[model samples]
Target chain A: ARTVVLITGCSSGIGLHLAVRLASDPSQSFKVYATLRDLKTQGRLWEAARALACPPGSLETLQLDVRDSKSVAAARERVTEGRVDVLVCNAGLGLLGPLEALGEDAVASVLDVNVVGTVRMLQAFLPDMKRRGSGRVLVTGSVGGLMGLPFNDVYCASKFALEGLCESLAVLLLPFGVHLSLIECGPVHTGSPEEVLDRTDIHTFHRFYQYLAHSKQVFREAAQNPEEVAEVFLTALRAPKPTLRYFTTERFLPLLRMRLDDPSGSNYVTAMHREVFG
Target chain B: ARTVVLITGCSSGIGLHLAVRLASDPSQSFKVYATLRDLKTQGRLWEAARALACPPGSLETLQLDVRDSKSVAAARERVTEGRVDVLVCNAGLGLLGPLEALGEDAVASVLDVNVVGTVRMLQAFLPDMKRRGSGRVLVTGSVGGLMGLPFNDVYCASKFALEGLCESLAVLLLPFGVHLSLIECGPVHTSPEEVLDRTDIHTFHRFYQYLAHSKQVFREAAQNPEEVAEVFLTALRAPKPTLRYFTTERFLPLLRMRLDDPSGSNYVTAMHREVFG
Candidate 1:
């Protein structure tokens, strides 16, 4: 039997890339349902699948709006047999600004997709996975999830909450013979940073100005193609005993090491102030 | 001049304990306005104040609910000089159960009091402190704030958010000579666990059973609330302040080692299993 995989946010980025890679697997060993918020983007994925000549029935696309629960549930209902050997909750949105500048709606919207969406998606499918006692869950987490950034407060918090959510669930899932993992990425070349960098509004705070200046270097150093991250996900999926975290890029460790070495956070504080700007 | 200080959730627990402890300071160097949700519990704090024979006007009680901004603002208005030298956002609530078991309201209320309440308290009082360029802000944070607990999902999430909040604010505030500290506390002698554990098992399978079995290992080794008070006071009064975390000496080293570990996965599992296994 082929491994059945379900991936979210498949219109573009890692979700799209991962879905294609899985469907194009040469072993003829897997089936994929690639979901996105809109079906208009279907041509791009299917075109790529056809170009690769993915085995017949190896790839399918569906519409899924992670922000809404009903949409996600209906998509799940549409899946034949409702069996998912691997679930990738990769749909998330990004928000940037100081904590004070972010209104409740902005913050709530971030949490709704990144945190609640991850939780609800799992809750919807976890029962059957539990009954089978063999499954894997991979959350596309970010360095933002682990570190506190100057202006990425709400985004980081949502990621931080994701860290907490995954860690809490990891142990519980262990006894049930399931694996849960967070694929932490530093900075993937998801797209051009220069486009977002013209953000003059970081224009406002001195701290933010420094971070924005440093981010270019940070991104340049850690940037990886979507394939690099997808491979890490593949490794996590096939591991004998899956761990709680995996870094797609090695450069992420330099940034994450401080939180590990110094809980008092002086080293982290000093390092961030000095390295992020200097 | 005695520093003017404002505190929240002072009816009982750390809020009340810290209030009386500060009031009874031998140097008489601080004035505290302890705010609680209801005035009905005022007697216990005042009675404790009297037993300590706190100086006149040293410790006064006020009404404030962390979830309500207007109430916090009114409590602020009652300050004599209308200048708060120190702000302690000590008001927080706990929710213990599986994440799925908690409704949106339940989680929202927790974040409202613990996370939003902290942010709002600082917003109401931070402007003046910023202009003056000298003040202390201490948040009554927890070990839960740093680590994700088995059953404490939203609570841990709220704290994790707080950790991010404080860390982000620390650098910005540091340039202003204003100190921001998180009083990282561990299991306090808060109360008996038996009553809470009787909760007929959350739907979460193995994690709950493992935690319930090991909670005794957790509580018996935990510290008390007064230790947190001393640390909070130390963070507030230090002229040349220290780092952002203010955990009890007992826990600081243990958590440090785990964080220092190269692999994030094994440490968390061993941690849960080491104590509970």
Candidate 2:
């Protein structure tokens, strides 16, 4: 039986790259469910897969809007018979705004897809994996989840909550053979940063806008290539015994080292801010 | 001018004991505001002060309910003149229930008195103290705040949030000469444990009742008199440089030691279950 891997948010970015990479590898021995929000993007992804000469039945593009419970249910129904060897919960959105500018809808939307959606997927799939006595669930989190920033409070809060959610789940799910992990990535160059910056209107927080602008500039400067992050994810997936947290970039390693070295110092944040700016 | 100390929730427990201790110390040259939720309870506290024969007007009992904003404001008006030398935010309530049984009102009340009440008091008095170039604000927190427990989820969350709030405030208030600190205690012998355990429902959470019962038993066993905890608070107040967290009881220090020695291997919940059971 082919090892079935479910990859969410495959229309673009790392998800799309993972789908192509998994499909192109003939010796990989896996069937990929390449999930995207809109089927209209189907031709583009299929064309890219064909260009890479991926096997015919290796990649199946399914429409999945993580925000819709029914959509997630329908997708689960489609893949119900196939045992999911690994579930990559990589669908999320970025919101950049001050507290006031962060309207109810924006915050709710981010939480819906990023937090609730991940939980729903876990609920939908984890039981079957548990019944079979094996599986892996990986959630794509961010370095922002681990630290607080000036204007990205909501984003940071959701990611931090996600980290806690996973941490607790790791212990709860330990009785079973299933493995739970969270990937905390530094700024990745998905062209998504520019979109986030474009959407951000700093005027809502008048005094804080200068700081927000400076932070955005710093993010733009430090972002790593998405391919580099994808490589890290693949490595995590392939590791015989996965670590609880996998830092996808060099920026992540140094920061983690600093935190480990000087757990008591205020210099951690100062060092992070300096590193990002420099 | 006598160095004035305003302490809230002084009717009983650590608040009442600390009030007695502060009033009795003469070389301290202090005027203590022994605030209670109700003036009726003032008789016993006053008698205790009288027995100690504290200086005339050295101890004064004022009616203040931490849950009531108007009462806090009124107390502030009566107590604060230029700058309070020390403001001990010891007014708090311990509520025990699973998150499922916990109504919004219950959570709100806990946060209101324990966290928001402290913040409101700080906001009202911090500016004056900062202008005077010296002051101390000590918040009474708990080990439950430092780590979450099974049945005491709401209480733990409120304390954790307060810890975060105070941590942020400490950083923000550092430039000013004002010092902020939190006293994290473990299972002090207060009526809170009995009161918490005496509530009618044996099970707040359906599947976790065994765990909840075990927790209640642990709380009962760990209860220590409020007088001993007052000594720790006094030590915290008198320290020349403010420490971030001061753990008073044996349970807290042992737990901290376990965490330090084993790092992540020491699971707080499992340890709590074993110790409490």
Q: Residue A120 of model 1: what lDDT?
A: 69
Per-residue lDDT tens digits for candidate 2, residues B1-277, read 8778888888877787778778888685778897888889877677777787888878877888876657877887888555588888888887654332344456456656665566556656665675576788877767665544544544664565455445444433444566776676666665434423432233212225445565585576554545445644554556553434544445554445433521222454354345345
Angstrom error of the Cα, residue B180, model 1: value is 1.5
Among all windows of 10 consecutive residues in model 1 chain B, the one with the lowest summed lDDT is B194-203
lDDT tens string, model 1, A1-278? 89999998887778888888888988888799999889998877887788888888898888888767688889888889568999999999887754445555666677777777776687667766766877898899988777777667667777887877777676456667778889997777871234333422233355565676777777777688887888888888888887788878677687678666776776676676666656
Q: Candidate 1 at B274: error in angstroms?
A: 2.6
C-alpha TM-scores of all predictions: 0.86, 0.59
Best by lDDT: 1
Candidate 2: residue B221 lDDT (0-100): 51
DockQ (Cα-based) per candidate?
0.36, 0.08
Compute the lDDT of residue A50 as modeled in candidate 1: 83
Off by over 4 Å in 1: A37-68, A191-204, B37-43, B60-64, B68-82, B191-208, B244-247, B252-254
